[PDB]
């Protein structure tokens, strides 16, 4: 509340929307794959385990 | 009765914004004014509202021009 001055989150516009089908991925970088031995077969099950 | 007066506009904060001998970067405003009270000199530009601004990095120098006129230049620091 700003004492009756129009508050900041009313003087600014709304923007955008939310995608219902938004896909978010789990991310593994190359540096995190360095913990496996040479010749390993990397799989989501192995990354989770 | 009542006064017919009571009005004024917002003060516009004109005048010098950098000192003679001071180092400024390019784009720095040196002087706000109405008209050419001070003229643009060397490496100094004059904006649409008559603002004087430095076009290079360098040192501000206020100098006389002619008999009754002034100018401000900026010179590259060696």
């Amino acid at each position: 509340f700003e004492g009756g001055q129009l508050p900041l989150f009313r003087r600014l516009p709304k923007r955008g929307f939310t995608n219902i089908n938004r896909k978010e991925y789990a991310i593994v970088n190359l540096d995190q794959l360095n913990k496996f031995e040479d010749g390993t077969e990397v799989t989501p099950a192995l990354l989770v385990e | 009765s009542s006064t017919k007066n009571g009005r004024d506009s917002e003060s516009k904060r004109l005048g010098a914004k950098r000192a003679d001998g001071q180092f400024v970067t390019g784009g720095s405003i040196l002087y706000r004014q109405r008209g050419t009270k001070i003229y643009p000199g060397e490496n100094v530009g004059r904006g649409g509202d008559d603002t004087l601004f430095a076009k290079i990095d360098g040192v501000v120098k206020f100098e006389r021009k002619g008999r009754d006129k002034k100018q401000v230049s900026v010179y590259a620091v060696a």
């Binding site: 700003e2 900041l8 989150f9 009313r10 003087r11 600014l12 516009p13 709304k14 923007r15 | -």
Partner: protein
């Protein structure tokens, strides 16, 4: 009980990596004949919520990460 997010605020800002809030610009709805070309072009560019305003409104968006 849980604190409640200010939903109006939540519709107008987004959190940045450093924890700041990216905001849209006022004066961008109508009356565009009265604002100059450069004014509108530069009003297309997003700003941040100022630190003075953050001091006032931070708790309203504590859950919006």
């Amino acid at each position: 009980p849980k604190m409640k997010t200010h939903r109006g605020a939540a519709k107008r800002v987004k959190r940045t990596a450093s924890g700041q809030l990216k905001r849209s610009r006022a004066f961008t709805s109508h009356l565009f004949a009265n604002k100059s070309t450069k004014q509108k072009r530069q009003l297309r560019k997003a700003r941040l919520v100022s630190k003075s305003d953050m001091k006032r409104v931070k708790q309203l968006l504590a859950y919006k990460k």
